[PDB]
From a paper:
Unexpectedly, crystals from the aerobically isolated oxidized form (prepared in the absence of formate) pressurized with 48 bar of CO2 in aerobic conditions resulted in a structure (HP_CO2) nearly identical to the Reox_120 min structure. The HP_CO2 structure shows the same SeCys dissociated form as well as clear electron density for a dioxygen/peroxide molecule coordinated to the W ion. Remarkably, a CO2 molecule is present near the active site, which has never been observed before. The CO2 molecule is found close to the W centre (4.3 Å away) and the catalytic SeCys (4.0 Å away), being stabilized by van der Waals contacts with the carbonyl of L440 and with the dioxygen ligand, plus a hydrogen bonding interaction to the NH of G442. This is further supported by the increased B-factor of the CO2 molecule (∼50 Å2), when compared with the B-factors of the neighbouring backbone (∼25 Å2) and sidechains (∼30 Å2). Since the SeCys dissociated form was also obtained with exposure to oxygen in the presence of CO2 (HP_CO2), the activity of DvFdhAB was also monitored in these conditions. In fact, co-exposure of a solution of non-activated DvFdhAB to oxygen and CO2 led to 80% loss of activity in 30 min, whereas full inactivation of the DTT-activated enzyme occurs in 30 minutes, or less.
In this context, the highly active, efficient, and selective metal-dependent Formate Dehydrogenases (Fdh) are very appealing systems that enable harnessing millions of years of natural evolution. Additionally, [4Fe–4S] clusters are present to convey electrons to/from the physiological partners. Additionally, the oxygen sensitivity of these enzymes must also be understood as it poses an important obstacle for biotechnological applications.
Residue numbers in the entry:
A (entry chain A): 36 to 861, 869 to 1005
B (entry chain B): 2 to 215
């Protein structure tokens, strides 16, 4: 026996940091009645096999931390001190602010007199760090108060990824999952530093290499990832589309594509209309006045029925594949090598290695996380990755896919719960002011006349109806639909997003902000502006684990409390290991975790804080009246609690959904109160509720499938590592999306050695088939209207094919592909005093703003201070020696950092001038620790991209001086 | 008894091993400053039994050779640290019959602190300037004696850290050297016949650390 663990209750948990979703075992003293005594990895967990990176390994020090918030705190306007106060004070006083601001600000109709039923006087930030059930509860609480300005972390990686992959495949999700990396024959890591930012991923990446895979890292910098890849190819910032386009030309010219896959599973054969053209770097239908495209000019030629025309012979010169060939012929090795800064021989090597996976029995995968996919053609950058994978038949297959790595442990789940301004849960859109009725809302869903096209999104009315029943089960959906707020149809969608919330704050157009499990004082670009702008708030509610740069902006650097009138409530939430719930990892694995210790001090689970707070707002409206009470009054919250408090189990079950009455549906009988087995069995007619149609299948009558810890596998499952009985992923436990593309029209795998699915005994074996139906009877991309993987994607703002537009404004004046330099649908100053390219990125040991990891002594030990990584070339020119203090400055601000001089940074040749990049972590902040440094977001512009609502953090102009 | 095989050709310098050592023994963190390196703590100490050392070696063509060395006691088959301490007092340094663990006891407060360090070919032992106790990697011997992996081994996601019977580990170390050579032709084993912590180096062990090998 080990004395340490001897008298402790052992529970299981999931890591609270990155979306790899590593298993933990927690040991809690007094057999559960006191504090955690140990936290380490869960050896039975199939992703991490008990391994943890230093962030997971430090979770004991995060939990049992004397610097954690103990009780609610209050800061009175113009005070320079916190007043500790009771939960009951803080929550009653917060509910009053909400009601006051809502009553005062509530709009029943916009200027056009259309029904909106909202308040624009309160914005919410957060959070990818809450449990799925807390995320879902939160988004419905805010919308019952009529908020529209609801955002979080996801915005920065959603705006690019989801439209790109949704355009290409029908969903925006990471196509495969972490264990599947081990099945790849070529792994290309481009816009990711996964050995630092998804460390346990490298278990399976190296297992791939053990089976003969080539590992390719493409990055401006040589990182800890580069150290362990077979090929490190440097690339100048923003040169990705050139690189990806050069690879497309390589694949087409060398005929290395998967011919049968392309012909039948991609839109390669669809005929594009005669209106489609591209010339001088502009697509047809360009409106130079408004810098907008008339996408209607990119439509397909339709047959009599309204189905796009096809030439399966791929002869017709207006076939997608023939237009594609013609489009990328300009991207030869010499131009691409010139602009990327990658040698002609090193490009040829990387292209040959990766295009080799066009073999039916070889699979290549692309991993990217944030990289530089923030600019106005990041969506196009990822589009090109999808098109390469479609050409090589790498989509739907083991060791293939676009592995768009999610960031935070539950950013996947928090996005699924519609904590972005534009989505309800389950990726149903927030209605605009022009969707007067529920029926009009439903009328927008695109329909198909192809009988071989599943076009699954036609089921939406069932999902919207069930979602509205889950909130308002007394009322009819059509009627309940008038409760939740709508956004102005005559208005730019980005007007509601992350970056414009900071604009509206600094214009004082917000009374109240919830900063709920976020640290925007550090996470926001141009921190100096964001901190000033927080003064123009009337009240602030910060919910977090510790006092922080957002809770305590009022006593920040160069701030005077006396002059700042913002009423701040700080509410301390409990840590991941002190509550029960589910988090959805990058692979869509929805994982249940348990409480170890009771919440520290007077800290509450977020679920309890938000439910208690809403309970006060409710009883206040019930006794005072005020603006449109029905949506608050009528909100079903009794389904969210047992024994006076928030019940993760019950919220989870409501999210799955149940029958409100006995129903025949699917051709099966169901009794009232039965849990809904799957989204296949939801209804549009009020028979069924379901908080999120993606969760239908997750908590059935069989029990909580997310809580399964069962490693049972058939030989065919275990060979590729599906673990179908370990927890549950959406949709309906399909672990590899688009898996119908992995077999031919007889249902035989392209690669039987790594089969995902297979037709045997007249059914699909292995993974859960992504779309019902016999082999060769349905198109494989079931969420696509046409049912095909899109090479040509005419839903994209910048054009149906990705095209190089220079993301670096300042140091580049030549585009070797067209006479269109910058994005034709998109004003940096480029002050010569700031001649170097600033870039921010992460280290393995710290998390986000560092709010969490700057409180963990062991992580501060390994990475105590903000640093500045520079080449020897720049170090020499600026007279900087390794370890020297340096000042890094820009038009937006200045900071001090310890110099790291290393060959891991190198100059890029841009138009015959050496261009120097300086690298900073954004992990640091003024509150902790002593001498840590402040956020590298003092230097970043609030000038983010107009075609996204996303900031510039990978390329901003700076100077670096020795101090 | 038991042997660690550490394949440095798979190390990402994630430093899970470093934190996992402190979490398990509840060791305090040092006072650190960045002085132009990711490496921290800068050296082994009384309260740090393991730190990952970082060296950058230049190479023709893009990038560098970035060498990583998670340093710990070698648990030598014939411990020079025992031989040295047995001069002043037996029991200050003992061996575990079954596992191979060389273990410092409370009675290192009696021996000459600096004597026992000098005797150590890998420069491993560290003194508490207050109590005079010597500290180092104890092999998580209590964990091992209970049939658990040492913390640093369990936490390692890359396949760098490997643990078990000296027979199995020397078989693994030999088979893996043959595989790793195909990529890194200069790959060698750190004193395979003297120690119970066998590092695979992708090149000259001296490039990793002054005292990487004896
Ligand atoms: N340790 C740790 N892990 C984390 C996080 C953390 O803070 N710390 N955060 C999590 C979150 S929220 C996210 S979004 C993910 C993000 O994970 P990543 O995207 O991997 O994060 P970064 O290190 O910011 O950027 C990745 C790499 O992109 C490179 N890069 C920069 N510019 C370009 C360019 O123009 N082209 C290309 N091809 N590459 C470029 C950088 O040099 C860097 O190595 O990580 C998650 N994991
Ligand atoms: N310069 C620069 N800026 C960046 C980036 C960059 O690369 N460079 N990255 C951007 C990206 S990709 C992202 S995602 C954002 C992230 O930026 P933020 O979301 O502001 O990040 P943090 O708040 O530091 O990290 C997540 C928060 O979750 C909180 N948390 C943890 N557990 C819980 C819990 O149980 N409940 C609650 N309520 N809170 C909890 C932590 O305390 C922490 O405050 O930053 C962006 N900012
Ligand atoms: S931070 Fe990510 S890789 Fe590290 S232990 Fe946690 S979940 Fe796993
Ligand atoms: S845990 Fe493993 S991969 Fe990470 S630094 Fe230690 S030895 Fe290297
Ligand atoms: S490495 Fe040094 S301290 Fe460890 S057993 Fe050998 S001589 Fe003793
Ligand atoms: S074996 Fe135990 S004591 Fe030794 S370095 Fe590893 S974790 Fe630390
Ligand atoms: S994220
Ligand atoms: W992120």
């Amino acid at each position: 026996e080990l004395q340490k663990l001897q008298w402790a209750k052992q529970t299981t948990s999931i890591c609270c940091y990155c979306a790899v979703g590593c298993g933990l075992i927690v040991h809690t003293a007094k057999d559960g009645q006191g504090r955690a005594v140990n936290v380490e990895g869960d050896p039975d967990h199939p992703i991490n096999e008990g391994s943890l990176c230093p962030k997971g390994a430090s979770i004991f020090q995060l939990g049992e931390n004397d610097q954690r918030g103990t009780q609610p705190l209050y800061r009175a306007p113009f005070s320079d001190t916190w007043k500790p106060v009771t939960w009951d004070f803080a929550l009653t006083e917060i509910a009053k602010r909400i009601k006051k601001t809502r009553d005062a600000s509530f709009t029943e109709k916009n200027a056009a007199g259309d029904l909106v039923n909202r308040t624009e006087a309160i914005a919410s930030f957060g959070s990818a760090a809450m449990d799925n059930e807390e995320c879902w509860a939160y988004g419905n609480i805010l919308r019952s108060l009529g908020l529209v300005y609801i955002e979080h972390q996801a915005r920065i990686x959603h705006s690019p990824t989801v439209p790109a992959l949704a355009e290409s495949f029908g969903r925006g999700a990471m196509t495969n999952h972490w264990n599947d990396l081990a099945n790849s024959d070529c792994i290309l890591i481009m816009g990711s530093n996964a050995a630092e930012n998804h460390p346990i991923a490298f278990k399976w990446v190296l297992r791939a290499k053990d089976k003969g895979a080539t590992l390719i890292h493409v990055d401006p910098r040589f990182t800890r990832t580069s150290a362990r890849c077979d090929v490190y190819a440097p690339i100048r910032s923003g040169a990705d589309i050139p690189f990806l386009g050069g690879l497309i030309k390589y694949i087409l010219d060398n005929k290395l594509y998967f011919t049968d896959y392309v012909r039948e599973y991609t839109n390669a054969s669809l005929i594009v209309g005669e209106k489609f053209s591209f010339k001088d770097g502009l697509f047809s239908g360009y409106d130079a006045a408004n810098k907008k495209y008339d996408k209607s000019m990119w439509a397909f030629e339709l047959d009599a029925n309204g189905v796009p025309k096809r030439d399966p012979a791929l002869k017709h010169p207006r076939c997608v594949i023939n237009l594609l060939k013609k489009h990328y012929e300009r991207y030869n090795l010499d131009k691409v090598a010139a602009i990327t800064g990658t040698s002609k021989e090193q490009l040829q090597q990387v292209y040959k290695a990766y295009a080799a996976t066009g073999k039916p029995d070889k699979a290549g995968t692309i991993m990217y996380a944030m990289g530089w996919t923030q600019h106005s053609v990041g969506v196009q950058n990822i589009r090109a990755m999808a098109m390469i994978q479609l050409l090589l038949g790498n989509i739907g297959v083991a060791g293939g896919g676009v592995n768009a790595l999610r960031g935070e442990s539950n950013v996947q789940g928090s996005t699924d719960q519609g904590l972005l301004a534009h989505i309800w849960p389950g990726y149903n859109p927030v209605p605009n002011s022009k969707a007067a009725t529920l029926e009009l809302y439903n009328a927008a869903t695109p329909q198909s006349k192809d009988p071989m096209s599943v076009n699954w999104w036609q089921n939406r009315p069932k999902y919207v109806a069930s979602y509205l029943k889950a909130l308002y089960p007394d009322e009819e959906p059509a009627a309940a639909y008038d409760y939740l707020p709508r956004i102005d149809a005559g208005r730019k969608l980005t007007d509601y997003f992350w970056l414009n919330i900071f604009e509206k704050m600094d214009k004082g157009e917000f009374k109240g902000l919830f900063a709920w499990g976020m640290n925007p004082a550090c996470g926001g670009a141009n921190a100096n502006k964001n901190r000033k702008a927080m003064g123009k708030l009337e009240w602030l509610v910060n919910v977090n684990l510790f006092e922080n740069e957002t809770s305590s902006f009022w006593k920040g650097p160069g701030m005077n409390p006396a002059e700042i009138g913002t009423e701040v409530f700080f509410l301390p939430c409990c840590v991941s290991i002190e509550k029960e719930g589910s988090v959805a990892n990058s692979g869509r694995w929805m994982q249940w975790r348990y409480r170890g210790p009771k919440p520290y001090a007077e800290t509450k689970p977020d679920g309890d804080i938000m439910l208690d707070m809403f309970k006060k707002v409710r009883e206040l409206y019930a006794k005072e009246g005020g603006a449109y009470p029905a949506p608050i009054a009528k909100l079903n919250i009794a389904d969210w609690e047992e024994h006076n408090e928030f019940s993760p189990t019950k919220v989870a079950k409501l999210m799955n959904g149940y029958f409100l009455k006995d129903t025949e549906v699917g051709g099966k009988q169901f009794k009232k109160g039965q849990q809904v087995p799957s989204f296949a069995f939801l209804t549009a007619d009020g028979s069924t509720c379901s908080g999120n149609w993606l969760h239908a299948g997750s908590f059935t009558d069989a029990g909580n499938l997310m809580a399964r810890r069962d490693k049972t596998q058939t030989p065919e499952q275990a060979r590729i590592g599906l673990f179908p009985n370990w927890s549950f992923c959406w949709p309906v436990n399909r672990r590899i999306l688009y898996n119908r593309a992995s077999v031919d029209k007889t249902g035989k795998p392209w690669n039987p050695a790594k089969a995902v699915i297979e037709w045997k005994d007249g059914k699909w074996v292995g993974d859960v088939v992504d779309g019902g139906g016999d082999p060769g009877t349905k198109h494989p991309f079931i969420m696509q209207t046409h049912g095909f993987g899109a090479l040509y994607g005419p839903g994209r703002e910048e054009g149906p094919f990705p095209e190089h537009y220079e993301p670096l404004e300042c140091p580049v004046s030549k585009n070797p592909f067209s006479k269109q330099l910058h994005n034709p649908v998109a004003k940096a100053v480029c002050d010569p005093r700031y001649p170097f390219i600033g870039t921010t990125y992460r280290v393995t040991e710290h998390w986000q703003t560092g709010l969490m990891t700057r409180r963990c002594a062991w992580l501060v030990e390994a990475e105590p201070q903000i640093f500045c990584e520079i080449s020897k070339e720049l170090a020499k020119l600026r007279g900087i020696g390794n370890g020297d203090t340096v000042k890094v400055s820009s038009l937006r601000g200045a900071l001090e950092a310890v110099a790291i001089v290393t060959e891991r940074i190198r100059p890029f040749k841009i138009e015959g001038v050496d261009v120097h990049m300086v690298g900073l972590p954004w992990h640091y902040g003024w509150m902790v620790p002593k001498n840590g440094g402040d956020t590298a977001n003092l230097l970043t512009p609030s000038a983010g991209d107009p075609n996204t609502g996303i900031p510039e953090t990978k390329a901003f102009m700076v100077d670096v001086r020795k101090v | 008894g038991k042997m660690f095989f550490v394949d440095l050709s798979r190390c990402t310098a994630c430093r899970g091993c470093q934190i996992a050592c402190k979490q398990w023994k509840n060791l305090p963190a040092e006072e650190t400053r960045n002085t132009g390196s990711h490496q921290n703590p800068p050296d082994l100490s009384y309260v740090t039994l393991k730190t990952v050392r970082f060296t950058e070696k230049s190479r023709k063509g893009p990038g560098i050779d970035w060498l990583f060395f998670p340093e710990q006691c070698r648990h030598c088959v014939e411990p020079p640290c025992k031989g040295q301490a047995d001069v002043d007092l037996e029991g200050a340094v003992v061996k575990d019959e079954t596992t191979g663990a060389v273990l410092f006891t409370e009675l290192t407060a009696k021996v000459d602190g600096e004597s026992v360090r000098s005797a150590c070919p890998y420069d491993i032992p560290r003194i508490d300037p207050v109590t005079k106790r010597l500290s180092k990697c104890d092999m998580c011997n209590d964990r091992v004696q209970n049939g658990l992996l040492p913390a640093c081994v369990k936490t390692c996601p890359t396949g760098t850290m490997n643990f078990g019977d000296e027979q199995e580990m020397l078989a693994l170390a030999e088979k893996r050297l043959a595989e790793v050579k195909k990529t890194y032709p200069g790959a060698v084993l750190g004193d395979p016949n003297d120690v119970r912590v066998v590092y695979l180096f992708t090149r000259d062990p001296k490039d990793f650390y002054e005292h990487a090998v004896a």
